[PDB]
Amino acid sequence: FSNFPISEETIKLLKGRGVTFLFPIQAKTFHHVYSGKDLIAQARTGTGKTFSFAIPLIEKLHGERKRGRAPQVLVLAPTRELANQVSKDFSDITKKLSVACFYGGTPYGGQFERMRNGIDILVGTPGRIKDHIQNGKLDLTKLKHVVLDEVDQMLDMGFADQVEEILSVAYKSEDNPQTLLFSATCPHWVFNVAKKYMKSTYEQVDLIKTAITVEHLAIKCHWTQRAAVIGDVIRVYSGHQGRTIIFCETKKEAQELSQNSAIKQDAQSLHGDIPQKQREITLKGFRNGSFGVLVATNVAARGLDIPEVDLVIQSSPPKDVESYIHRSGRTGRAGRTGVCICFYQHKEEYQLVQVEQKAGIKFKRI
Ligand SMILES: [Mg+2]
Numbered sequence: 001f002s003n004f005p006i007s008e009e010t011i012k013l014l015k016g017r018g019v020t021f022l023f024p025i026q027a028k029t030f031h032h033v034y035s036g037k038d039l040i041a042q043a044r045t046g047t048g049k050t051f052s053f054a055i056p057l058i059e060k061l062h063g064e065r066k067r068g069r070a071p072q073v074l075v076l077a078p079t080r081e082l083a084n085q086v087s088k089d090f091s092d093i094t095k096k097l098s099v100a101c102f103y104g105g106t107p108y109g110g111q112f113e114r115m116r117n118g119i120d121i122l123v124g125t126p127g128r129i130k131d132h133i134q135n136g137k138l139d140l141t142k143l144k145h146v147v148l149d150e151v152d153q154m155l156d157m158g159f160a161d162q163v164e165e166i167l168s169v170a171y172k173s174e175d176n177p178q179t180l181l182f183s184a185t186c187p188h189w190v191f192n193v194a195k196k197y198m199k200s201t202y203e204q205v206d207l208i209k210t211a212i213t214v215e216h217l218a219i220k221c222h223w224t225q226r227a228a229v230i231g232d233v234i235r236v237y238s239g240h241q242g243r244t245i246i247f248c249e250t251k252k253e254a255q256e257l258s259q260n261s262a263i264k265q266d267a268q269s270l271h272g273d274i275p276q277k278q279r280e281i282t283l284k285g286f287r288n289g290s291f292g293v294l295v296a297t298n299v300a301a302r303g304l305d306i307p308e309v310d311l312v313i314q315s316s317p318p319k320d321v322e323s324y325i326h327r328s329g330r331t332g333r334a335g336r337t338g339v340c341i342c343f344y345q346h347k348e349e350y351q352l353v354q355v356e357q358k359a360g361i362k363f364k365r366i
Contacts, residue, residue: 005034006055007062013093019051021366023236024217026052028205033057036178038198040191042206044184045150046235050089053147053180058094061120069118070139071100074170074177075147076126076163078154080105086149087123097121102128112137126154126162133169140170143177151183151190160189171197184239207237209337214328217341218352218363226343230313231262234293237339243286243309245327246295253315258295270296270304298323308333314342317351321358 001011001021014020022030025043029052032039043049057073064072075090077083080103087101100114102124111128115137122129132138146167148154154163170177179198181190186206194202221229230246238244248254251271258269268282268291279300286294287307296304298320312331318324324340331338342363344352356362 004030006059010055010059010062010093013095014051014055017047017089017092019047022048022051023233023366024215024364025205025207025236029053030056032203032205033178033180034060038179038194038202040181040183040186040194040198040202040204040206042183042186042204044235044239046232047089048232048236049182050086051093053182054086054090054093057121057145058090058097061097062094065118067118068116069098069120070142071119071122072143073121073145073147074129074140074143075121075123075149076129076154076166077123077149078125078157078159079103080125082150082153083123083125087121090121090123094121099123102132104128126159126166130162130166133166140166141172143170145180146170146177147180147182148193149182151181152185152187155187155189164193167193167197207336207339209332209335212337214331214338214340216328216361216363217339218365219341219343220346220349220365221343223345226315227257227260227262229343230257233313233339233341234263234266234311237341238292238310241289242292242311243307243333244293244311244313245301245306245309246293246313246315247301247318247327248295248297248315249319251297254295254297257315258293263293263295266291267293267295270294271300272297274300301327306330309338310336311339311341314340316348317342317344317355321355324355325359325361 026048029041033053034056061072075086077086083101083103087099091099097120098118099121100119102111104125104127133140183190219229234244246257251273254269254271258267270279270282285291309331310333312327328338328340331340342352
């Protein structure tokens with residue numbers, strides 16, 4: 001987070017959660033939130049998605065304690081489970097601000113005490129929040145930020161009407177709260193909300209090829225932690241009905257990685273020690289969406305008819321840089337920018353520099 005508008009204290013708290021970086025798509029959300037802009041972001045459930053809004057909002061508030069104070073931030077989540085995770089993430093990176101979590105199927109007593117004592121960041125489900133507005137205990141007239149998290153799930157559950165009622169209280173045109181909308185897909189209801197509640201100058205973060213062509217990222221990671229980071233990149237960059245190829249050197253690396261719990265459910269391997277008939281079947285299956293993650297060695301990948309994919313991952317810097325560039329060309333479906341990730345170890349640091357010289361390319365070192 002060097003030259004990121006985050007305090008040293010916050011960076012130390014993030015380290016305590018094993019957060020040492022934000023993926024570029026998350027890093028882009030940070031700047032839009034930090035700059036005060038209204039936003040529609042496209043990302044699914046993840047650790048870094050919550051931090052994309054939590055870190056810049058917390059920094060803002062820390063810069064800006066009366067008993068019974070009204071919240072400054074409202075985060076609506078569709079379930080008790082999701083609300084509890086968002087609240088915990090805020091609470092883990094701020095020891096200064098009062099963080100509260102309000103959901104249904106629970107008594108009012110504890111929630112009443114939080115409101116009596118004062119709240120800075122309020123996380124909750126629409127039903128319970130609406131109830132507290134109605135009973136006159138919750139003040140949403142002093143909000144500065146509103147986050148509508150997992151709008152897809154929220155709408156699927158039938159909350160659209162209740163969310164519209166809640167927003168109608170906080171957005172009574174000038175000096176309205178900063179509005180942040182998050183989802184994995186962008187339904188009709190998302191832009192209908194933006195058209196009414198959001199400023200005409202609202203931003204969008206979704207990976208559609210906006211004069212970039214192809215992203216080349218570099219991740220410094222010890223081999224023992226690579227599988228957890230690989231799952232995280234797929235969750236962040238690839239989506240539902242997503243195509244991802246992971247390239248390895250050794251057949252054991254590809255086999256073990258495909259068998260590894262991080263992606264075991266969605267992954268399938270392709271190496272020399274697999275019969276040709278099965279290698280044929282498996283590639284055909286990948287093409288016709290039987291599974292979403294193909295873990296193949298760089299050897300078996302030579303000459304193999306690979307389709308257009310969302311994300312290309314390298315376990316270590318590529319020795320055949322020529323093949324790496326060809327695969328970059330065959331990345332980025334449905335008008336979206338292609339993501340090319342290269343994992344490297346401290347010992348493989350110069351090995352990644354060779355790729356850059358040989359290809360005449362610059363990796364976003366994250
Ligand atoms: Mg076919």
